[PDB]
Amino acid sequence: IYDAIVVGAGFSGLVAARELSAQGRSVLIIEARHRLGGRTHVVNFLGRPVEIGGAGVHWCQPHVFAEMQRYGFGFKEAPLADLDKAYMVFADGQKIDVPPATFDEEYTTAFEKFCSRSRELFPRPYSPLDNHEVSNLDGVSARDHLESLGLNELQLASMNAELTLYGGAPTTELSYPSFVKFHALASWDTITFTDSEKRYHVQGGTNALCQAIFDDCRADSEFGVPVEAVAQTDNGVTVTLADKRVFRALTCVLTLPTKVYADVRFEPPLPPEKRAFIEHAEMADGAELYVHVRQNLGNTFTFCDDPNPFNAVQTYAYDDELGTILKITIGRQSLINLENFDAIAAEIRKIHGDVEVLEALPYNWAMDEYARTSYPAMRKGWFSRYKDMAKPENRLFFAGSATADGWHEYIDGAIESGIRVGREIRHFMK
Numbered sequence: 001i002y003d004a005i006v007v008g009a010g011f012s013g014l015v016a017a018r019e020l021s022a023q024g025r026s027v028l029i030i031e032a033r034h035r036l037g038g039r040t041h042v043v044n045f046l047g048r049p050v051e052i053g054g055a056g057v058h059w060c061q062p063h064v065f066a067e068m069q070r071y072g073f074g075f076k077e078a079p080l081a082d083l084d085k086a087y088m089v090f091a092d093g094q095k096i097d098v099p100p101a102t103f104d105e106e107y108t109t110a111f112e113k114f115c116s117r118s119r120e121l122f123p124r125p126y127s128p129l130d131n132h133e134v135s136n137l138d139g140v141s142a143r144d145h146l147e148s149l150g151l152n153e154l155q156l157a158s159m160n161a162e163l164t165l166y167g168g169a170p171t172t173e174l175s176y177p178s179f180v181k182f183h184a185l186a187s188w189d190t191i192t193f194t195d196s197e198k199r200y201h202v203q204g205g206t207n208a209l210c211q212a213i214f215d216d217c218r219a220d221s222e223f224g225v226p227v228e229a230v231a232q233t234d235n236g237v238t239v240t241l242a243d244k245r246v247f248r249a250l251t252c253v254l255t256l257p258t259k260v261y262a263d264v265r266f267e268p269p270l271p272p273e274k275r276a277f278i279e280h281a282e283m284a285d286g287a288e289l290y291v292h293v294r295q296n297l298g299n300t301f302t303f304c305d306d307p308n309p310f311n312a313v314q315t316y317a318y319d320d321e322l323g324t325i326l327k328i329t330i331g332r333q334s335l336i337n338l339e340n341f342d343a344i345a346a347e348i349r350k351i352h353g354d355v356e357v358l359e360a361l362p363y364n365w366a367m368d369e370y371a372r373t374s375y376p377a378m379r380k381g382w383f384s385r386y387k388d389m390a391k392p393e394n395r396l397f398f399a400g401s402a403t404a405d406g407w408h409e410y411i412d413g414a415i416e417s418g419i420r421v422g423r424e425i426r427h428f429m430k
Protein backbone atom coordinates (compact mmCIF):
# COMPACT_ATOMS: atom_id res chain seq x y z
CA ILE A 1 0.00 0.00 0.00
CA TYR A 2 2.00 2.96 -1.33
CA ASP A 3 1.76 6.62 -0.47
CA ALA A 4 1.74 7.35 -4.20
CA ILE A 5 1.64 5.44 -7.46
CA VAL A 6 3.16 7.43 -10.34
CA VAL A 7 2.02 6.22 -13.76
CA GLY A 8 4.62 7.01 -16.42
CA ALA A 9 8.42 7.49 -16.39
CA GLY A 10 8.83 10.42 -18.74
CA PHE A 11 10.05 13.73 -17.39
CA SER A 12 6.77 14.59 -15.59
CA GLY A 13 6.42 11.24 -13.85
CA LEU A 14 10.10 11.06 -12.95
CA VAL A 15 10.12 14.56 -11.42
CA ALA A 16 6.84 13.82 -9.58
CA ALA A 17 8.37 10.65 -8.12
CA ARG A 18 11.59 12.48 -7.22
CA GLU A 19 9.66 15.21 -5.39
CA LEU A 20 7.46 12.75 -3.47
CA SER A 21 10.46 10.56 -2.62
CA ALA A 22 12.31 13.63 -1.32
CA GLN A 23 9.31 14.39 0.90
CA GLY A 24 9.80 10.98 2.56
CA ARG A 25 6.73 9.43 0.91
CA SER A 26 6.61 5.85 -0.42
CA VAL A 27 6.39 5.76 -4.22
CA LEU A 28 5.72 3.16 -6.89
CA ILE A 29 6.52 4.06 -10.50
CA ILE A 30 4.62 2.10 -13.18
CA GLU A 31 5.82 2.46 -16.80
CA ALA A 32 4.47 0.68 -19.88
CA ARG A 33 7.78 0.73 -21.76
CA HIS A 34 11.08 -0.94 -20.93
CA ARG A 35 12.86 2.43 -20.72
CA LEU A 36 12.78 5.91 -19.22
CA GLY A 37 12.01 9.12 -21.04
CA GLY A 38 8.63 8.77 -22.76
CA ARG A 39 8.53 11.22 -25.66
CA THR A 40 12.23 11.81 -25.14
CA HIS A 41 14.28 8.95 -26.54
CA VAL A 42 17.88 8.29 -27.61
CA VAL A 43 18.61 5.60 -30.22
CA ASN A 44 21.49 4.44 -32.40
CA PHE A 45 21.73 5.64 -35.99
CA LEU A 46 24.81 4.51 -37.90
CA GLY A 47 26.46 3.70 -34.59
CA ARG A 48 25.89 7.23 -33.23
CA PRO A 49 23.50 8.03 -30.36
CA VAL A 50 20.84 10.47 -31.60
CA GLU A 51 17.82 12.15 -30.03
CA ILE A 52 14.66 10.96 -31.76
CA GLY A 53 12.12 12.67 -29.52
CA GLY A 54 12.31 16.00 -27.71
CA ALA A 55 15.74 17.45 -26.90
CA GLY A 56 15.91 21.23 -27.47
CA VAL A 57 16.24 23.31 -24.29
CA HIS A 58 17.26 26.81 -23.21
CA TRP A 59 17.93 28.56 -19.91
CA CYS A 60 14.83 30.70 -20.47
CA GLN A 61 12.98 27.44 -19.60
CA PRO A 62 13.40 27.56 -15.83
CA HIS A 63 12.20 24.13 -14.73
CA VAL A 64 14.44 22.12 -17.06
CA PHE A 65 17.29 24.55 -16.39
CA ALA A 66 16.96 23.93 -12.64
CA GLU A 67 17.21 20.17 -13.18
CA MET A 68 20.21 20.61 -15.49
CA GLN A 69 21.83 22.65 -12.69
CA ARG A 70 20.98 20.00 -10.09
CA TYR A 71 22.51 17.12 -12.05
CA GLY A 72 25.28 18.95 -13.89
CA PHE A 73 24.04 18.94 -17.51
CA GLY A 74 25.20 21.65 -19.90
CA PHE A 75 23.83 23.22 -23.10
CA LYS A 76 25.23 21.63 -26.26
CA GLU A 77 25.54 24.19 -29.07
CA ALA A 78 24.07 23.43 -32.47
CA PRO A 79 26.35 24.35 -35.44
CA LEU A 80 24.48 27.48 -36.57
CA ALA A 81 27.42 29.70 -37.59
CA ASP A 82 28.64 26.80 -39.77
CA LEU A 83 25.37 26.80 -41.77
CA ASP A 84 26.19 26.73 -45.46
CA LYS A 85 22.79 26.88 -47.18
CA ALA A 86 19.18 27.50 -46.17
CA TYR A 87 16.21 26.53 -48.33
CA MET A 88 12.50 27.31 -48.28
CA VAL A 89 10.10 24.90 -49.97
CA PHE A 90 6.72 26.51 -50.55
CA ALA A 91 3.33 24.84 -50.41
CA ASP A 92 3.26 24.51 -54.22
CA GLY A 93 6.62 22.70 -54.17
CA GLN A 94 8.82 25.54 -55.45
CA LYS A 95 12.19 25.61 -53.64
CA ILE A 96 14.31 28.73 -53.13
CA ASP A 97 17.83 29.20 -51.78
CA VAL A 98 17.87 32.01 -49.19
CA PRO A 99 21.04 33.53 -47.69
CA PRO A 100 20.86 32.67 -43.99
CA ALA A 101 21.01 36.34 -42.98
CA THR A 102 18.02 37.17 -45.19
CA PHE A 103 16.17 34.09 -43.98
CA ASP A 104 16.71 35.07 -40.34
CA GLU A 105 15.63 38.68 -41.02
CA GLU A 106 12.41 37.68 -42.78
CA TYR A 107 11.54 34.87 -40.31
CA THR A 108 12.19 36.93 -37.17
CA THR A 109 10.34 39.99 -38.48
CA ALA A 110 7.37 37.74 -39.34
CA PHE A 111 7.56 36.11 -35.89
CA GLU A 112 7.57 39.50 -34.19
CA LYS A 113 4.46 40.48 -36.14
CA PHE A 114 2.70 37.20 -35.32
CA CYS A 115 3.51 37.54 -31.60
CA SER A 116 3.20 41.32 -31.29
CA ARG A 117 0.38 41.06 -28.72
CA SER A 118 2.26 38.65 -26.43
CA ARG A 119 2.85 41.23 -23.66
CA GLU A 120 -0.78 42.45 -23.82
CA LEU A 121 -2.16 38.92 -23.76
CA PHE A 122 0.31 37.32 -21.31
CA PRO A 123 1.57 39.74 -18.66
CA ARG A 124 2.20 36.76 -16.35
CA PRO A 125 2.79 33.87 -18.75
CA TYR A 126 3.20 31.24 -16.00
CA SER A 127 -0.37 32.29 -15.11
CA PRO A 128 -1.54 32.29 -18.71
CA LEU A 129 -5.25 32.78 -18.17
CA ASP A 130 -4.72 35.97 -16.11
CA ASN A 131 -5.91 38.08 -19.07
CA HIS A 132 -9.40 36.80 -19.78
CA GLU A 133 -9.17 37.91 -23.42
CA VAL A 134 -7.01 34.84 -24.16
CA SER A 135 -9.99 32.55 -23.46
CA ASN A 136 -11.96 34.33 -26.18
CA LEU A 137 -9.04 34.35 -28.64
CA ASP A 138 -8.55 30.59 -28.11
CA GLY A 139 -10.92 29.83 -30.99
CA VAL A 140 -8.91 31.90 -33.49
CA SER A 141 -6.62 29.64 -35.49
CA ALA A 142 -2.96 30.34 -36.08
CA ARG A 143 -3.74 30.55 -39.79
CA ASP A 144 -6.56 33.08 -39.27
CA HIS A 145 -4.10 35.34 -37.46
CA LEU A 146 -1.23 34.69 -39.86
CA GLU A 147 -3.31 35.84 -42.83
CA SER A 148 -4.19 39.14 -41.10
CA LEU A 149 -0.59 40.34 -40.90
CA GLY A 150 0.31 41.44 -44.45
CA LEU A 151 3.40 39.22 -44.60
CA ASN A 152 5.45 38.78 -47.75
CA GLU A 153 5.79 35.40 -49.47
CA LEU A 154 8.80 34.09 -47.54
CA GLN A 155 7.50 35.43 -44.23
CA LEU A 156 4.14 33.70 -44.73
CA ALA A 157 5.58 30.36 -45.84
CA SER A 158 8.26 30.15 -43.17
CA MET A 159 5.86 31.10 -40.36
CA ASN A 160 3.27 28.62 -41.62
CA ALA A 161 5.90 25.85 -41.72
CA GLU A 162 6.88 26.73 -38.14
CA LEU A 163 3.25 26.72 -36.99
CA THR A 164 2.55 23.42 -38.83
CA LEU A 165 5.43 21.87 -36.90
CA TYR A 166 4.30 23.26 -33.53
CA GLY A 167 0.70 22.24 -34.08
CA GLY A 168 1.43 18.87 -35.67
CA ALA A 169 -1.58 19.80 -37.78
CA PRO A 170 -2.78 22.20 -40.45
CA THR A 171 -2.47 25.68 -38.97
CA THR A 172 -6.24 26.18 -39.32
CA GLU A 173 -6.47 23.90 -36.24
CA LEU A 174 -3.89 25.43 -33.86
CA SER A 175 -4.97 27.76 -31.06
CA TYR A 176 -3.41 31.18 -31.91
CA PRO A 177 -2.83 32.33 -28.28
CA SER A 178 -1.39 28.95 -27.24
CA PHE A 179 1.63 29.64 -29.48
CA VAL A 180 1.96 33.34 -28.62
CA LYS A 181 2.28 32.26 -24.99
CA PHE A 182 5.72 30.75 -25.77
CA HIS A 183 6.92 34.17 -26.96
CA ALA A 184 5.73 35.68 -23.69
CA LEU A 185 7.52 32.96 -21.70
CA ALA A 186 10.69 33.92 -23.58
CA SER A 187 10.59 37.43 -22.09
CA TRP A 188 8.22 38.65 -24.83
CA ASP A 189 11.33 38.61 -26.99
CA THR A 190 11.57 37.31 -30.55
CA ILE A 191 15.33 36.75 -30.54
CA THR A 192 15.16 34.81 -27.27
CA PHE A 193 12.30 32.61 -28.44
CA THR A 194 13.76 31.92 -31.88
CA ASP A 195 17.09 31.16 -30.19
CA SER A 196 15.41 28.76 -27.76
CA GLU A 197 14.03 26.61 -30.56
CA LYS A 198 17.35 26.03 -32.36
CA ARG A 199 20.53 26.89 -30.46
CA TYR A 200 20.94 24.27 -27.71
CA HIS A 201 20.18 20.69 -26.65
CA VAL A 202 20.92 18.66 -23.51
CA GLN A 203 24.65 17.89 -23.47
CA GLY A 204 24.98 14.16 -22.83
CA GLY A 205 21.44 13.40 -23.94
CA THR A 206 17.95 13.40 -22.48
CA ASN A 207 18.27 9.74 -21.50
CA ALA A 208 21.15 10.50 -19.13
CA LEU A 209 19.21 13.35 -17.53
CA CYS A 210 16.19 11.08 -17.03
CA GLN A 211 18.50 8.46 -15.54
CA ALA A 212 19.94 11.00 -13.11
CA ILE A 213 16.46 11.98 -11.92
CA PHE A 214 15.42 8.34 -11.68
CA ASP A 215 18.56 7.50 -9.67
CA ASP A 216 17.56 10.21 -7.16
CA CYS A 217 14.19 8.51 -6.55
CA ARG A 218 13.65 6.21 -3.58
CA ALA A 219 10.82 4.27 -5.19
CA ASP A 220 9.81 0.84 -6.35
CA SER A 221 9.73 0.46 -10.13
CA GLU A 222 7.67 -1.71 -12.49
CA PHE A 223 8.52 -1.53 -16.21
CA GLY A 224 7.18 -3.25 -19.30
CA VAL A 225 3.44 -3.64 -18.64
CA PRO A 226 0.87 -0.86 -19.07
CA VAL A 227 -1.76 0.25 -16.62
CA GLU A 228 -5.20 -0.87 -17.79
CA ALA A 229 -7.47 0.45 -15.01
CA VAL A 230 -7.46 2.84 -12.05
CA ALA A 231 -10.12 2.75 -9.32
CA GLN A 232 -10.40 5.13 -6.37
CA THR A 233 -12.46 5.37 -3.20
CA ASP A 234 -12.55 7.69 -0.19
CA ASN A 235 -9.62 5.70 1.26
CA GLY A 236 -7.25 4.94 -1.62
CA VAL A 237 -6.62 3.90 -5.21
CA THR A 238 -6.09 0.52 -6.84
CA VAL A 239 -4.20 0.27 -10.13
CA THR A 240 -4.42 -2.80 -12.37
CA LEU A 241 -1.95 -3.65 -15.11
CA ALA A 242 -2.82 -5.38 -18.39
CA ASP A 243 -1.26 -8.57 -16.99
CA LYS A 244 -3.85 -8.34 -14.16
CA ARG A 245 -1.40 -7.50 -11.38
CA VAL A 246 -2.83 -4.99 -8.92
CA PHE A 247 -1.17 -2.23 -6.89
CA ARG A 248 -2.69 0.02 -4.25
CA ALA A 249 -1.85 3.41 -2.82
CA LEU A 250 -3.28 6.45 -1.08
CA THR A 251 -2.86 8.65 -4.17
CA CYS A 252 -2.09 8.22 -7.86
CA VAL A 253 -0.27 10.59 -10.24
CA LEU A 254 -1.21 10.03 -13.88
CA THR A 255 1.21 11.39 -16.47
CA LEU A 256 -0.23 9.59 -19.49
CA PRO A 257 -0.29 11.46 -22.79
CA THR A 258 -3.70 13.03 -23.12
CA LYS A 259 -5.08 10.67 -25.79
CA VAL A 260 -3.89 7.54 -23.96
CA TYR A 261 -6.43 8.10 -21.15
CA ALA A 262 -9.03 6.72 -23.57
CA ASP A 263 -7.24 3.35 -23.24
CA VAL A 264 -7.56 3.17 -19.43
CA ARG A 265 -10.66 2.37 -17.38
CA PHE A 266 -11.32 4.84 -14.57
CA GLU A 267 -13.61 3.91 -11.66
CA PRO A 268 -15.43 6.23 -11.04
CA PRO A 269 -15.21 7.67 -14.56
CA LEU A 270 -13.35 10.90 -15.18
CA PRO A 271 -15.65 13.96 -15.13
CA PRO A 272 -17.17 15.31 -18.36
CA GLU A 273 -14.74 18.21 -18.56
CA LYS A 274 -11.75 15.84 -18.59
CA ARG A 275 -13.32 13.42 -21.05
CA ALA A 276 -14.01 16.36 -23.37
CA PHE A 277 -10.39 17.53 -23.13
CA ILE A 278 -9.16 13.98 -23.77
CA GLU A 279 -11.30 13.70 -26.90
CA HIS A 280 -10.69 17.13 -28.42
CA ALA A 281 -7.81 19.19 -27.03
CA GLU A 282 -4.77 17.43 -28.55
CA MET A 283 -4.00 16.65 -32.18
CA ALA A 284 -0.26 16.73 -32.95
CA ASP A 285 0.45 14.20 -35.69
CA GLY A 286 4.23 14.32 -35.52
CA ALA A 287 7.05 11.94 -36.37
CA GLU A 288 10.87 12.16 -36.39
CA LEU A 289 13.18 10.73 -39.03
CA TYR A 290 16.90 10.28 -39.57
CA VAL A 291 18.29 9.78 -43.09
CA HIS A 292 21.74 8.84 -44.39
CA VAL A 293 22.74 10.39 -47.75
CA ARG A 294 25.84 9.20 -49.60
CA GLN A 295 26.81 12.70 -50.77
CA ASN A 296 28.36 15.28 -48.46
CA LEU A 297 25.74 18.07 -48.57
CA GLY A 298 27.49 20.32 -46.09
CA ASN A 299 25.52 22.03 -43.30
CA THR A 300 22.05 22.80 -44.61
CA PHE A 301 18.65 23.73 -43.23
CA THR A 302 15.32 23.40 -45.07
CA PHE A 303 11.86 24.57 -44.05
CA CYS A 304 9.01 23.02 -46.02
CA ASP A 305 5.53 24.43 -45.77
CA ASP A 306 2.41 22.30 -45.44
CA PRO A 307 1.50 19.99 -47.26
CA ASN A 308 5.08 19.02 -47.87
CA PRO A 309 5.75 16.26 -45.31
CA PHE A 310 9.28 17.15 -44.11
CA ASN A 311 8.63 20.47 -42.40
CA ALA A 312 12.16 20.83 -40.99
CA VAL A 313 15.29 19.17 -42.41
CA GLN A 314 18.38 19.78 -40.27
CA THR A 315 21.94 18.52 -40.69
CA TYR A 316 23.17 16.30 -37.86
CA ALA A 317 26.57 15.46 -39.37
CA TYR A 318 28.44 15.65 -42.67
CA ASP A 319 31.84 14.70 -44.09
CA ASP A 320 33.47 13.23 -47.16
CA GLU A 321 33.38 9.62 -45.92
CA LEU A 322 30.12 9.63 -43.97
CA GLY A 323 28.13 11.64 -46.45
CA THR A 324 25.32 13.40 -44.61
CA ILE A 325 23.03 12.54 -41.72
CA LEU A 326 19.80 14.57 -41.89
CA LYS A 327 17.42 15.01 -38.94
CA ILE A 328 13.86 15.50 -40.17
CA THR A 329 10.84 16.63 -38.17
CA ILE A 330 7.44 15.79 -39.63
CA GLY A 331 4.46 17.72 -38.28
CA ARG A 332 1.88 15.54 -40.10
CA GLN A 333 2.99 11.92 -40.45
CA SER A 334 -0.32 11.22 -42.18
CA LEU A 335 1.23 12.87 -45.26
CA ILE A 336 3.86 10.19 -45.91
CA ASN A 337 4.17 6.42 -45.54
CA LEU A 338 7.22 6.14 -43.32
CA GLU A 339 7.36 2.37 -43.89
CA ASN A 340 8.07 3.03 -47.61
CA PHE A 341 11.81 3.70 -47.93
CA ASP A 342 11.73 4.77 -51.58
CA ALA A 343 8.94 7.29 -50.83
CA ILE A 344 11.15 8.80 -48.12
CA ALA A 345 14.06 8.88 -50.58
CA ALA A 346 11.93 10.60 -53.20
CA GLU A 347 11.09 13.42 -50.78
CA ILE A 348 14.79 13.83 -49.91
CA ARG A 349 15.64 14.12 -53.63
CA LYS A 350 12.85 16.70 -54.10
CA ILE A 351 14.74 18.91 -51.61
CA HIS A 352 18.39 18.07 -52.14
CA GLY A 353 18.45 17.08 -55.79
CA ASP A 354 20.92 14.62 -57.24
CA VAL A 355 21.56 12.45 -54.18
CA GLU A 356 21.44 8.81 -53.07
CA VAL A 357 19.56 7.92 -49.90
CA LEU A 358 21.14 4.91 -48.15
CA GLU A 359 19.32 4.34 -44.82
CA ALA A 360 16.35 5.77 -42.94
CA LEU A 361 15.24 5.46 -39.31
CA PRO A 362 11.72 6.81 -38.64
CA TYR A 363 10.07 7.08 -35.24
CA ASN A 364 6.32 7.56 -35.74
CA TRP A 365 5.28 9.14 -32.44
CA ALA A 366 1.65 9.55 -33.50
CA MET A 367 1.39 5.79 -34.17
CA ASP A 368 3.18 4.84 -30.92
CA GLU A 369 0.37 3.56 -28.68
CA TYR A 370 2.03 4.94 -25.52
CA ALA A 371 2.39 8.47 -27.01
CA ARG A 372 -0.34 8.99 -29.68
CA THR A 373 0.57 12.68 -29.94
CA SER A 374 4.10 13.91 -30.53
CA TYR A 375 3.69 16.94 -28.19
CA PRO A 376 0.69 18.70 -26.57
CA ALA A 377 -0.26 21.13 -29.29
CA MET A 378 -3.61 22.65 -28.36
CA ARG A 379 -6.52 22.65 -30.78
CA LYS A 380 -8.23 26.01 -31.19
CA GLY A 381 -10.81 26.48 -28.45
CA TRP A 382 -9.04 24.11 -26.05
CA PHE A 383 -5.80 25.76 -24.87
CA SER A 384 -7.73 27.74 -22.28
CA ARG A 385 -9.40 24.58 -20.90
CA TYR A 386 -6.15 22.93 -19.78
CA LYS A 387 -6.97 23.43 -16.08
CA ASP A 388 -9.88 21.03 -16.68
CA MET A 389 -7.18 18.42 -17.31
CA ALA A 390 -4.63 19.51 -14.68
CA LYS A 391 -6.97 19.73 -11.67
CA PRO A 392 -7.11 16.84 -9.16
CA GLU A 393 -10.03 14.43 -8.91
CA ASN A 394 -9.97 13.43 -5.22
CA ARG A 395 -7.09 10.93 -4.92
CA LEU A 396 -6.11 11.09 -8.60
CA PHE A 397 -3.66 13.83 -9.65
CA PHE A 398 -2.67 14.72 -13.17
CA ALA A 399 0.66 15.79 -14.64
CA GLY A 400 2.40 15.85 -18.00
CA SER A 401 3.35 18.60 -20.44
CA ALA A 402 -0.29 19.21 -21.42
CA THR A 403 -1.16 20.15 -17.84
CA ALA A 404 1.57 22.78 -17.55
CA ASP A 405 0.91 26.49 -17.13
CA GLY A 406 4.04 27.44 -19.03
CA TRP A 407 5.90 25.53 -21.72
CA HIS A 408 3.14 23.01 -22.40
CA GLU A 409 4.65 21.56 -25.62
CA TYR A 410 8.02 21.02 -23.94
CA ILE A 411 10.16 19.06 -21.52
CA ASP A 412 10.10 22.17 -19.33
CA GLY A 413 6.32 21.93 -18.96
CA ALA A 414 6.53 18.25 -18.10
CA ILE A 415 8.99 19.08 -15.31
CA GLU A 416 6.86 21.99 -14.11
CA SER A 417 3.88 19.66 -13.83
CA GLY A 418 5.94 17.18 -11.81
CA ILE A 419 6.95 19.86 -9.29
CA ARG A 420 3.35 21.09 -9.09
CA VAL A 421 1.77 17.68 -8.59
CA GLY A 422 4.30 16.91 -5.86
CA ARG A 423 3.10 20.08 -4.16
CA GLU A 424 -0.57 19.11 -4.51
CA ILE A 425 0.06 15.72 -2.92
CA ARG A 426 2.17 17.33 -0.19
CA HIS A 427 -0.87 19.34 0.82
CA PHE A 428 -3.36 16.51 0.30
CA MET A 429 -1.36 14.46 2.80
CA LYS A 430 -1.09 17.35 5.29
Ligand SMILES: Cc1cc2nc3c(=O)[nH]c(=O)nc-3n(C[C@H](O)[C@H](O)[C@H](O)COP(=O)(O)OP(=O)(O)OC[C@H]3O[C@@H](n4cnc5c(N)ncnc54)[C@H](O)[C@@H]3O)c2cc1C
Pocket (backbone or CB within 6 Å): 007, 008, 009, 010, 011, 012, 013, 030, 031, 032, 033, 036, 037, 038, 039, 040, 052, 053, 054, 055, 056, 057, 225, 226, 227, 228, 255, 256, 257, 260, 264, 286, 287, 288, 329, 365, 369, 370, 371, 374, 375, 376, 399, 400, 401, 402, 408, 409, 410, 411, 412, 414
Ligand atom coordinates in the same frame (compact mmCIF):
# COMPACT_ATOMS: atom_id res chain seq x y z
C1 LIG B 1 9.70 14.58 -32.24
C2 LIG B 1 9.56 15.40 -30.98
C3 LIG B 1 10.17 16.66 -30.89
C4 LIG B 1 10.06 17.45 -29.72
N1 LIG B 1 10.93 18.55 -29.57
C5 LIG B 1 11.01 19.09 -28.33
C6 LIG B 1 12.05 20.01 -28.02
O1 LIG B 1 12.92 20.36 -28.86
N2 LIG B 1 12.16 20.49 -26.72
C7 LIG B 1 11.25 20.12 -25.76
O2 LIG B 1 11.35 20.64 -24.64
N3 LIG B 1 10.24 19.23 -26.01
C8 LIG B 1 10.13 18.73 -27.26
N4 LIG B 1 9.19 17.75 -27.49
C9 LIG B 1 8.10 17.52 -26.50
C10 LIG B 1 8.58 16.76 -25.25
O3 LIG B 1 9.36 15.64 -25.67
C11 LIG B 1 7.30 16.20 -24.46
O4 LIG B 1 6.43 17.31 -24.32
C12 LIG B 1 7.67 15.68 -23.06
O5 LIG B 1 8.71 14.75 -23.23
C13 LIG B 1 6.45 14.93 -22.42
O6 LIG B 1 6.82 14.53 -21.19
P1 LIG B 1 5.56 13.89 -20.30
O7 LIG B 1 6.26 13.39 -19.12
O8 LIG B 1 4.42 14.80 -20.32
O9 LIG B 1 5.01 12.71 -21.26
P2 LIG B 1 5.74 11.39 -21.81
O10 LIG B 1 7.19 11.49 -21.89
O11 LIG B 1 4.93 10.87 -22.93
O12 LIG B 1 5.58 10.25 -20.53
C14 LIG B 1 4.40 9.63 -20.29
C15 LIG B 1 4.79 8.19 -19.94
O13 LIG B 1 3.61 7.34 -19.75
C16 LIG B 1 3.91 6.04 -20.31
N5 LIG B 1 2.60 5.36 -20.52
C17 LIG B 1 1.74 5.58 -21.54
N6 LIG B 1 0.63 4.80 -21.41
C18 LIG B 1 0.86 4.06 -20.22
C19 LIG B 1 0.10 3.07 -19.54
N7 LIG B 1 -1.14 2.63 -19.96
N8 LIG B 1 0.62 2.59 -18.41
C20 LIG B 1 1.83 3.00 -17.96
N9 LIG B 1 2.64 3.92 -18.53
C21 LIG B 1 2.12 4.45 -19.68
C22 LIG B 1 4.63 6.37 -21.62
O14 LIG B 1 5.33 5.24 -21.98
C23 LIG B 1 5.58 7.52 -21.14
O15 LIG B 1 6.75 7.06 -20.60
C24 LIG B 1 9.32 16.96 -28.64
C25 LIG B 1 8.70 15.69 -28.73
C26 LIG B 1 8.81 14.90 -29.89
C27 LIG B 1 8.13 13.54 -29.94
Ligand SMILES: [Ca+2]
Pocket (backbone or CB within 6 Å): 081, 082, 083, 084, 299
Ligand atom coordinates in the same frame (compact mmCIF):
# COMPACT_ATOMS: atom_id res chain seq x y z
CA1 LIG C 1 30.31 25.91 -43.07
Ligand SMILES: [Ca+2]
Pocket (backbone or CB within 6 Å): 187, 188, 189, 190
Ligand atom coordinates in the same frame (compact mmCIF):
# COMPACT_ATOMS: atom_id res chain seq x y z
CA1 LIG D 1 9.46 42.22 -27.53
